[PDB]
Write a protein that binds this DNA or RNA. Sequence first.
DNA 1: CAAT
Length: 374
Amino acid sequence: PQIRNMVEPMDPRTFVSNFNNRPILSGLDTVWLCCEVKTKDPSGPPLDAKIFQGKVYPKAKYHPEMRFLRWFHKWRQLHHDQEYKVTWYVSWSPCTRCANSVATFLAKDPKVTLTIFVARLYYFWKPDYQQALRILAEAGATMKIMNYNEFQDCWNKFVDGRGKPFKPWNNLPKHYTLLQATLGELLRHLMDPGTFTSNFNNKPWVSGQHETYLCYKVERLHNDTWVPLNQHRGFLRNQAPNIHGFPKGRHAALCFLDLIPFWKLDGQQYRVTCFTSWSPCFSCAQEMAKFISNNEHVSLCIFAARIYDDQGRYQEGLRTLHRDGAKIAMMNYSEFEYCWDTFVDRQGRPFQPWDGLDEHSQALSGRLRAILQN
DNA sequence: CAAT
Ligand SMILES: [Zn+2]
Ligand SMILES: [Zn+2]
């Protein structure tokens, strides 16, 4: 039995119009949901597959997530009980009602695990919808943003492409990174402690890997005092090159600069701080210096674990960044501890500093000062 | 992890 025999594949124009992942997208009156039900073993065809659709308004009871729940209840009565792995590709993330219904269903049934790939985040800026996605995640649903691979898979399985291959729309990768970072913020995703310790150790770097992790937070000026702005706190990393994502990669500092306009900050004074495992290369620093030159109400503070020699003009880039008003400093014990406490999935464990932390911070601080004073 |  093949997916083509299980579903009526949707029209290609229905798929592309409904699954376009522009984060802010008006005019869509419908939610689409493609799903597969599998055993514990993921290889081969699913046990069954279905496409559900429902109008957003006026009744959530006809949203495709609830249509799925009613179909799946009846389907299970007709098949021999076993453990099920369910995958959804949904055009909009769940509204508050569906999120709470699915969360209740998952939490009462240890035999079912659910992964939800979403094309767009629905009302991601509204606290009610944020809290509902957290309840769904806490019920064990794995919630991810649809990337190129999932759009292509959904095209192959659920669309009447007539053998033509999936063609990505404009800016699919840029949309993905904005949504991924936004989903991480609202789920309050914390960084793996091993990933933190490995990447923020400031001893001389000996690994062949060049990856950059970047933790960020935002403050607002209020009554001559900086106050936390808890909505936009999290971490991200560089995007490795891939011809279906960013063909030349996208460095962490640039992904961070992409986020700031997406936050829709008002005209008040803001201080945006990042803790990055590598200081920015020349290209990143130029872009960062351009940004702060053009956004006078945003103050940048950059704390770096290590100084990245890009074999080019990185020293001049750091000088330009400082000249244009960014604060640049090397992370000391206090900044390492703050990120462990704030951004890392530490499970109550205190910060344990690696060997030579203080000594390496002093050496790097002296190198930075020498760079900035030329 | 299809990898400037
Ligand atoms: Zn709903
Ligand atoms: Zn860079």
